[PDB]
Amino acid sequence: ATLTQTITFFALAAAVIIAALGVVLLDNVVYSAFLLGGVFLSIAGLYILMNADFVSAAQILIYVGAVNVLILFAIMLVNKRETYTPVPGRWLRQGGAAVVSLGVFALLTKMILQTPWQLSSVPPTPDSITTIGQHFFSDFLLPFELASVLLLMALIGAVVLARRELVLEPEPILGEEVVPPLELPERPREP
Amino acid sequence: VFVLSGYEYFLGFLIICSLVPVLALAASALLRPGAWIQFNVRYYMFALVFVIFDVETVFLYPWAVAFHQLGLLAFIEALIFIAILVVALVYAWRKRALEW
Amino acid sequence: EVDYNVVDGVVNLTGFVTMVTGEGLKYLQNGRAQFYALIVLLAVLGFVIFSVQ
Amino acid sequence: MQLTYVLILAALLFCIGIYGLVTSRNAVRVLMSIELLLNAVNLNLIGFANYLDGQQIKGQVFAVFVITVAAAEAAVGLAIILAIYRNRDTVDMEKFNLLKW
Amino acid sequence: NAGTILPETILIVTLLVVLLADLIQGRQADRWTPYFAIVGLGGAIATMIPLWTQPATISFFGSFISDHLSLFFRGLIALSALGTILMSIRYVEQTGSSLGEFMTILLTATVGGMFIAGAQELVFIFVALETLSIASYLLTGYTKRDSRSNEAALKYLLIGAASSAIFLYGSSLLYGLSGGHTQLPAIAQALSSESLGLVVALVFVIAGISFKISAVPFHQWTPDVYEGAPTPVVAFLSVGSKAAGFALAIRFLTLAFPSVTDQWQLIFTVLAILSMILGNVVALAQTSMKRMLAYSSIGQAGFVMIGFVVGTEAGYASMLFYLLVYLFMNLGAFTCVILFSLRTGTDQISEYAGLYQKDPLLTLGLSLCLLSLGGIPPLAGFFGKIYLFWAGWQAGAYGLVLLGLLTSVISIYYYIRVVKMMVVKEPQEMSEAVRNYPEVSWSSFGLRPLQVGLVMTVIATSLAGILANPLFNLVNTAVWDVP
């Protein structure tokens, strides 16, 4: 009854790292984008195994249901059927990134094992939606009010950077010397 | 330790409902014999307003569950979160974001 | 001519090996923003071998 | 499954995100490879909350705010790519090296 | 207990009022809505003077402190956005963009940086660092049809959200080395062992601390953001987004890591002895003024760390004051680049040549803000650097001040080169404004906020060193709350 919490851990920990290699190494980006839901669901499977029932149910809603749907719309909008496959562009700088990523991984594993953690043998989660909500309005209140300011700004900014300029695309507003519409006035010039 | 109660049947029901399509599509496997979408940025724009409002819903679920054990000061503070993200909603109508 | 070429040659060499040092690290930036993400990540690996001994 | 095996899972999930952050040639695959880093700092964070400070979870509260930031960073993050695609009609990170020196 | 975040919640009200006037009135509101943000930011400064005499309370259940240093760095970040709205009232209104939607992002990055300088918990640092950093990606690609701001918006995101992932990995281990304890004074009593976990927790957070300030292995975004972004945004990312990064470096490394302290005085030395080199020698071979001022601010960030790594009561007070006079130089240098870029296009060096007989308020203005950055007397950046090397020479550090002096001479060469091509070039050697300057008016929309934004900085550049004895006592009294 406990080995079925170990077998379902390693079957979820291998569900993420084979999907995390899928979102990075796969040759097609739509097959790469759909597997990102495989990362976000399997990671949400681990949060239930780590006694985090609310943080898992809040991850399928945001990461799989909102972010991953946002990724898929933002890839069906850009396909364009022009990959041009210039794989040997300038150099073999994709092997230099395999050394820093393997370097950080061997660096972190040496840190993880030898560091004495003070793990406690107490039973966790006394109904962790009640003790997570008495944190939002006592201690974590000012990060909770700044999350509202961050999200409103993220809607003002992401609308004005992606909307269509159908109000006035040919608008010569004024002039001392000439400026194009919706561009910074420092015109490009080569010395 | 696993002090969540009620999740013993969740791992079994996850497998059996997953065995509903993979076995039925195999039970049917033994019985059977100018391409443009236009780039219209509204599929992105309807999905951006989801993410800003799928996160607002998540932040109010600890408030709604633990409401009647918190009080009025946690309702004034939780009204600032709603009243600011209403201004995000009026911004989306007025700037023709969710027009379609 | 030892004034105009030797002791004036040293002073006009401090101003030459600093202008060609500037045009050598002007080529450190090259665009390609992933290469900028290497140097952020390599220096993270550097300072944790630097500072543990 | 102990505390140690979640961290080596999180430390490995980080470094696949690093490898996608540096090698990927699509402009959108860098954004998915950023999200792997912002899950490895979540898998580290809840795993630090279950075995350490289990009675009052300060990690699962801090695990909530990482999702809302990365959901707001990918909503901003794809707005930028969608501003580039209307000007430069490709998404190629070896084509955005025009601010060279 | 929420009387201590009153300077920020005058800006959150002002964030909504300058936004709601954009939806109600719709670009007829830009005649009056920039001047409400000035009285909101100035109203945010004016209510810290009642808070400066208060005995440094720790409000919001330990998540925000209102010490003397947190009152100081909340002053510069609101003042840098006060100086930016004075510039950007015509600039982005000349692009054709809506002016109410620009200030709503800028007065959110202002409230982001005001909440880093007084934050005390590991989560409130990260969210406040995010909302300053998220709003900074949107401002650098705000013009949205430039093919330069588009590639500068993306170079800032794939490093900024990258370094916000390295910063979170060091915040998460710091929660894990201690037994919980996400507050910063509760961390330092729990960890004292100086093990390998503490060092990896230390380098991973100063890969995100030292990204806002652009130390030189992490400096790579700054010369490629600064020539792509709109120029008032650049005027905020060099003063506001650097005082916010320098305020985090004191609130973190002196609170979270006082046990390990010989190491982050050694990593920030290598960031100091190398950003003075590559900030100053690479600015020589730069043609654009917005890219010359990019490598200056990498190198000018190297002078501030000389006061940082020494660790004395005169050490930190010397880096607080140098930021106080650096606000009076970049906001007077970028004011004149904007004022030159609005009159004629292509604001680059070797197009300034032939000034001093056409717009001599700019030429007198831009000179005293470029000469002071090189540290010539009697301007503010001479008196600012003297207190650095008086702080460096007081406690060890004989080689940090000397590298800060041989590279303070190379800094003279590229500031003078603009002052050369403004005042010494004859009227047979002018390229643009060969009777092509627009015959200056100061009467159109928003030009008179620019004229008052330049005169009140050039006056504050030339006189800040002679009248430095008020500011030296305002800054030395903000340091007794730093352990």
Curated annotation (Swiss-Prot), chain B:
It catalyses: a plastoquinone + NADH + (n+1) H(+)(in) = a plastoquinol + NAD(+) + n H(+)(out); a plastoquinone + NADPH + (n+1) H(+)(in) = a plastoquinol + NADP(+) + n H(+)(out). Its EC number is 7.1.1.-. It is a multi-pass membrane protein. The chain crosses the membrane at residues 10-30, 45-65, 70-90. It is found in: Cellular thylakoid membrane. One of its GO terms (biological process) is photosynthesis, light reaction. InterPro entries: NAD(P)H_OxRDtase_bac/plastid, NADH_UbQ/plastoQ_OxRdtase_su3, NDAH_ubi_oxred_su3_sf. Belongs to the complex I subunit 3 family. NDH-1 shuttles electrons from an unknown electron donor, via FMN and iron-sulfur (Fe-S) centers, to quinones in the respiratory and/or the photosynthetic chain. The immediate electron acceptor for the enzyme in this species is believed to be plastoquinone. Couples the redox reaction to proton translocation, and thus conserves the redox energy in a proton gradient. Cyanobacterial NDH-1 also plays a role in inorganic carbon-concentration. This is NAD(P)H-quinone oxidoreductase subunit 3. It comes from Thermosynechococcus vestitus (strain NIES-2133 / IAM M-273 / BP-1). The lineage of its organism: Bacteria, Bacillati, Cyanobacteriota, Cyanophyceae, Acaryochloridales. The gene is ndhC.
UniProtKB/Swiss-Prot annotation, chain E:
GO terms for cellular component: plasma membrane-derived thylakoid membrane. Signal peptide: none annotated. Pfam families: Ndh2_N, Proton_antipo_M. Keywords: Membrane, NAD, NADP, Plastoquinone, Quinone, Thylakoid, Translocase, Transmembrane, Transmembrane helix, Transport. It is found in: Cellular thylakoid membrane. It catalyses: a plastoquinone + NADH + (n+1) H(+)(in) = a plastoquinol + NAD(+) + n H(+)(out); a plastoquinone + NADPH + (n+1) H(+)(in) = a plastoquinol + NADP(+) + n H(+)(out). It comes from the Bacteria. NDH-1 can be composed of about 15 different subunits; different subcomplexes with different compositions have been identified which probably have different functions. NDH-1 shuttles electrons from an unknown electron donor, via FMN and iron-sulfur (Fe-S) centers, to quinones in the respiratory and/or the photosynthetic chain. The immediate electron acceptor for the enzyme in this species is believed to be plastoquinone. Couples the redox reaction to proton translocation, and thus conserves the redox energy in a proton gradient. Cyanobacterial NDH-1 also plays a role in inorganic carbon-concentration. This is NAD(P)H-quinone oxidoreductase subunit 2.
